[PDB]
Design a binder for this molecule. Structure first.
Ligand SMILES: Nc1ncnc2c1ncn2[C@@H]1O[C@H](COP(=O)(O)OP(=O)(O)NP(=O)(O)O)[C@@H](O)[C@H]1O
Ligand SMILES: O=C(C[C@H]1NCCC[C@@H]1O)Cn1cnc2cc(Br)c(Cl)cc2c1=O
Ligand code: NA
Length: 482
């Protein structure tokens, strides 16, 4: 009912349920894989959505909105997906003439019109984005935020005269996804390129951002940015008149990130007292709680607290003053801790006498006293350090989850020990399923290749692939995955 009753290590999954619900982030729903986002949760989405929008306007990306529905034949104009499509069949009691499908992505919808908007080089680059929801009916069991059947996302689609233009933006968007996670969610991600076997069917290459849940040792795709080259341009006959009057195919990118990011954050920073929010995604930065008992204290406290509130708010630091008389101080402590509020300020008699108050960080529970005069400044610096600390703890933790090894058995040791592994690899696609099905022999417990990180350690000259025996091309991250 109230309090988290499962240790994050002991039942991590029951923990997650308890946290997301009891923190007022979500509510479950009578349709599997769909979840209600209460304001505490949606606020987080809005914050990142603001950030991302800001950043893509600088790349002249423009928002837009395409329809939620797509027709059978249009949709089937990408591979291995059709069993995941939800079909609208009727309206009221009337069967529709043809099935129509709910968007799982907007490629087919959008790219059918592109040729119409793109006749010449003067038309390029074309840069669109959507904030919409999409629907995929997925076999693997749904889990709030991480794998949802409906989900909010942003989906970006661009088209350019040439690769230099296009690829450059791919990596531009990838960095924005890093910042999304690091500057806002304080979640560290590793940028990489996916393997041929795991990359997006219609992409030249898929660049990715990868996170890792230490507790169950599962990696997770945090965001995705593709160079598509001309693949879709061939499929939808999207062409332009060159600066010389030769017809050309366009070079496109698509990229997207979803509410999954919210789940990643929760899993990262959440603890046994409950939700822990980086301040940049919590409406309330501070909760002010009075702690006193003699009735004589009552007016003078209500004031001191109301004063402290005034200071913060003036400074555009939103906060709550829990002054409710029918709740124990410990109720209030637990409650706001659980809800993720970064800072509690405690006000009692010893602080009025002393012109001060106790501040307490949500991230690690250090308390201090600070003279009222300098509360504003100390609160601001605190909030920053809480971000600094949440992030840095999470990067120390990520790094300890990554073991660099060279042999197959070193690999299995690491995998058995809930790690993810950095290993030399030849990159032959034929090895991927072998490696998957054969590790799974010792949610799916196979070792997937996650991403070939951009930041490569050096490659010894004779270094062999840990599986093929073939000489290894580059270091790749492998792990069990969400
Ligand atoms: N069911 C889902 N719920 C929430 N987010 C999702 C879901 N499926 C994919 N994503 C995210 O969507 C982004 C874009 O990738 P996309 O190509 O749409 O999905 P995917 O690669 O098919 N799924 P996965 O195997 O789970 O990473 C990725 O960063 C995924 O993390
Ligand atoms: O959705 C994608 C590719 C990209 N589209 C928008 C930007 C980011 C995103 O990775 C991969 N994908 C994922 N799931 C799908 C599910 C179905 Br059903 C279909 Cl038809 C198609 C797809 C499908 O194409
Ligand atoms: Na994943």
């Amino acid at each position: 009912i109230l309090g988290i009753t499962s240790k994050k290590i002991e039942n991590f999954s029951d923990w997650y349920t308890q946290v997301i619900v009891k923190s007022e982030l979500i509510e479950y729903y009578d349709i599997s894989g769909c979840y209600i986002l209460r304001p505490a949760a949606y606020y987080i989405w809005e914050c990142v959505q603001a950030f991302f929008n800001k950043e893509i306007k600088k790349l002249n990306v423009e928002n837009s909105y395409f329809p939620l529905f797509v027709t059978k034949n249009k949709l089937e104009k990408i591979e291995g997906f059709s069993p995941e499509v939800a079909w609208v069949t009727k309206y009221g009691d009337s069967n529709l003439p043809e099935e129509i499908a709910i968007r799982p992505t907007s490629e087919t919808i959008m790219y059918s019109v592109f040729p119409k908007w793109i006749r010449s080089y003067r038309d390029l680059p074309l840069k669109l984005n959507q904030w919409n929801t999409v629907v995929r009916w997925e076999f693997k069991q749904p889990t709030p935020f991480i794998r949802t059947r409906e989900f909010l996302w942003q989906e970006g689609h661009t088209a350019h005269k040439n690769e230099e233009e296009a690829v450059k933006l791919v990596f531009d968007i990838l960095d924005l996804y890093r910042r999304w996670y690091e500057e806002y969610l304080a979640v560290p991600i590793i940028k990489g390129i996916k393997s041929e076997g795991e990359k997006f069917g219609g992409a030249n290459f898929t660049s990715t951002a990868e996170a890792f849940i230490s507790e169950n040792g599962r990696a997770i795709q945090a965001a995705t940015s593709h160079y598509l080259g001309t693949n879709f341009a061939k499929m939808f006959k999207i062409e332009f008149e060159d600066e010389n009057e030769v017809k050309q195919y366009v070079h496109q990118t698509s990229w997207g990130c979803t509410t999954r990011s919210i789940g990643i954050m929760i899993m990262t920073h959440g603890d046994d007292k409950g939700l822990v929010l980086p301040p940049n995604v919590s409406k309330y930065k501070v909760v002010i709680v009075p702690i006193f008992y003699k009735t004589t204290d009552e007016n003078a406290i209500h004031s001191y607290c109301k004063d402290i509130e005034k200071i913060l708010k003036n400074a555009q630091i939103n906060c709550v003053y829990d002054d409710r008389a029918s709740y124990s101080p410990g109720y209030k402590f637990n409650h706001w801790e659980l809800r993720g509020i970064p800072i509690r300020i405690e006000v009692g008699p010893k602080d009025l006498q002393n012109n001060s108050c106790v501040i307490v960080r949500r991230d690690n529970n250090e308390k201090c006293n600070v003279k009222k005069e300098s509360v504003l400044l100390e609160t601001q610096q605190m909030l920053v350090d809480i971000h600094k600390n949440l992030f840095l703890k999470a990067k120390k933790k990520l790094d300890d989850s990554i073991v660099q090894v060279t042999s197959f058995s070193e690999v299995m040791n690491a995998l058995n020990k809930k790690k993810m592994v950095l290993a030399p690899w030849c990159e032959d696609i034929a090895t991927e399923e072998e490696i998957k099905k054969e590790t799974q022999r010792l949610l799916s417990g196979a070792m997937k290749p996650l991403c070939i990180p951009l930041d490569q350690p050096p490659m010894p000259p004779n270094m062999k692939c840990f599986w093929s025996g073939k000489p290894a091309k580059r270091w790749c991250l492998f792990g069990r995955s969400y």
